[PDB]
Amino acid sequence: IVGGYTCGANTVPYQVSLNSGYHFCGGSLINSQWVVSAAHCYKSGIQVRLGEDNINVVEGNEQFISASKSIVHPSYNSNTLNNDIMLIKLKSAASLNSRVASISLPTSCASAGTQCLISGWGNTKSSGTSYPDVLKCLKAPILSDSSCKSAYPGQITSNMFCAGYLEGGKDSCQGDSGGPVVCSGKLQGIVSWGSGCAQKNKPGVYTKVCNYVSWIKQTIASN
Ligand SMILES: [Ca+2]
């Protein structure tokens, strides 16, 4: 997260870190046995880490559970990042509490102008590199599709939405991918891509989760 603030330990209970020997992506816990993340974060040997704040220090609220199965969206296109969403099933259910909790899926799409909370352990600089050890947060509004498509001509599909600031300075970034974008207590987006981080007129592009609620529910129910 660039230009954000330190969330605080366990203040974002649905935030998970995907670890394959190191943190490589974020994700959101939707129920005790399922995690949603970005399809571009796919890889084998994923261990899900919940209840994390400092990902390099065992502070006592963590739950490390390996994935039993990963399901990348049927129509995921790695070249365009269209349908950048993936589901991960845990080998065993997580113990839910005030520090480790699931996030509700939306029943309707959120409108432009809605303020959301984006979080992750990604790079904190628009130029250069600096990865934090504790969870970073950012409040940003959903941008209109018009400004979103003007910012990224020929690249924004109906399954994407922009959130952030056209002025730049604040945005999600490398390492934040797969993370949550929560608005009104509902998971509305997944950190997907953007041109660099926090650049002027290059806001973050997020997977529009409301378009995938049926696929998520049906997959969970049969797996
Ligand atoms: Ca820790």
The CATH number for 35's domain is 2.40.10.10
- Please give the Cα distance from 115 to 213 (Å, whole number): 21
Same domain, 6 and 32: no
Identify whether residues 55 and 119 lie together within a single domain: no
Where is the binding site for substrate, in residues? 171-172, 174-175, 177
Query: How close is the Cα of 220 to the center of ligand 1, in Å?
Result: 28
Dist. CA 100 → ligand 1 center (Å): 13
Measured in Å, residue 89 CA sits from the centre of ligand 1 at 22
List residues forming the annotated binding site.
52, 54, 57, 62, 171-172, 174-175, 177
* Residues contributing to the annotated binding site for Ca(2+): 52, 54, 57, 62
Place of tokens 């950190």: 191
Distant-in-sequence, close-in-space partners of 123: CB < 8 Å, separation ≥ 6: 2, 129, 130, 131, 173, 174, 175, 176, 197
- State which residues form the domain around 4: 1-12+103-210
Together in a domain, 65 and 150: no
Same domain, 149 and 189: yes
Does one domain contain both 192 and 124? yes
Which residues neighbour ligand 1 (ion) by CB within 5 Å?
A: 52, 54, 57, 59
In DSSP terms, 190 is beta-bridged to: 180, 207
Same domain, 87 and 49: yes
Is residue 217 domain-shared with residue 166, that is, in the same domain?
Answer: no
Same domain, 112 and 206: yes
CA of 152 to the centre of ligand 1 (A): 37
Q: State in Å, rounded, how far the first CA of the chain is from the last one.
A: 33
117 and 7 in a common domain: yes
Per the structure, the count of domains in the chain is 2
Active site residues: 40, 84, 177
Strand, coil or helix: what is 210? helix
Experimental technique of record: X-ray
Within 8 A by CB and 6+ apart from 222, the residues are none
Give alpha helix (H) positions in the chain: 145-151, 213-221
Check whether residue 89 and residue 136 sit in a common domain: no
Q: Are 48 and 27 in contact (CB under 8 A)?
A: yes
Among 210, 128, 121, 207, residue whose Cα is nearest residue 163: 207
Residues 123, 202 within the same domain: yes
Residues 41, 121 within the same domain = no
CA of 94 to the centre of ligand 1 (A): 16
Q: If you count them, how many residues does the chain have?
A: 223
